[PDB]
């Protein structure tokens, strides 16, 4: 179907780990995409091969209005092209750096937007596990967008047995190894939820085993600007165990998230 010679490439969009996302534009079309470049050579010397395989088939038969579609992919004798939809707004990631915090508005509404794509997932029993501020892209209409469903699984599962990962994000769970369900990314959720409102992650630390230790302690506090229903709802995300954690309907309703989110 689709081949490199039918495209024309833009500016690079951004730069992920196995090769950097650029913009591009179909040539009898002229239909803006992101096609995201992967190299064969470093992927096979990570075997990640069966990564990009369940992101391109997990993400391609995804529909979802706060979820970032995958239109299709194809590829060469060096690398693989994965074609994107494109996120005018880049990442909630530099969205952080430029205003630092968010309010209660913004963060609410991201909250949300996040709820209703994961629920979405969860009812088709998928796992992103790998919900970022990098990965968080923006719309048009600045809406929200998961993508990088790298480590997107059909399933209950346990580790692939490797991490490249900035802990920060992981569930207790899968940082000790366990057999794992959709209930890590309620956690997710709640790491998101509490860096949208202070600037950074509620386990943040220097080093990978300091950090280690923090979210598997669930060493946390919050700083004096974070309200009581923030505070609350953070609070219930962020269990050390899989079962206490809410469900996506007991996030779309508490009362902090209503009473400030507008979507
Ligand atoms: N469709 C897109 N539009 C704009 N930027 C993108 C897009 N897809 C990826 N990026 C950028 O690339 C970065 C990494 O690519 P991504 O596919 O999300 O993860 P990975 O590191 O697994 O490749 C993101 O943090 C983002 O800044
Ligand atoms: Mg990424
Ligand atoms: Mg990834």
Redesign the pocket.
Known sequence: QWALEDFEIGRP??????GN?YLAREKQSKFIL?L?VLFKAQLEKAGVEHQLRREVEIQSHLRHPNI?RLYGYFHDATRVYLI????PL??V?RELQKLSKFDEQRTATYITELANALSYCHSKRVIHRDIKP??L?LGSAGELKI??F?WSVHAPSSRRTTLCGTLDYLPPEMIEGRMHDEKVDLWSLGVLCYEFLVGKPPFEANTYQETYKRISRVEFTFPDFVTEGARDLISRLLKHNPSQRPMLREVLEHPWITANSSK
């Not at 969009?13 to 196995?18: D, I, V």
């Not at 994107?84 to 996120?87: F, I, K, P, S, V």
Request: aromatic share 14%; hydrophobic share 40%.
């Open positions: 969009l951004g730069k992920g780990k196995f996302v992101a995201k970032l994107l939809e494109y996120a880049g990442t990631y990098e990965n892209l993508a990088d790298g």
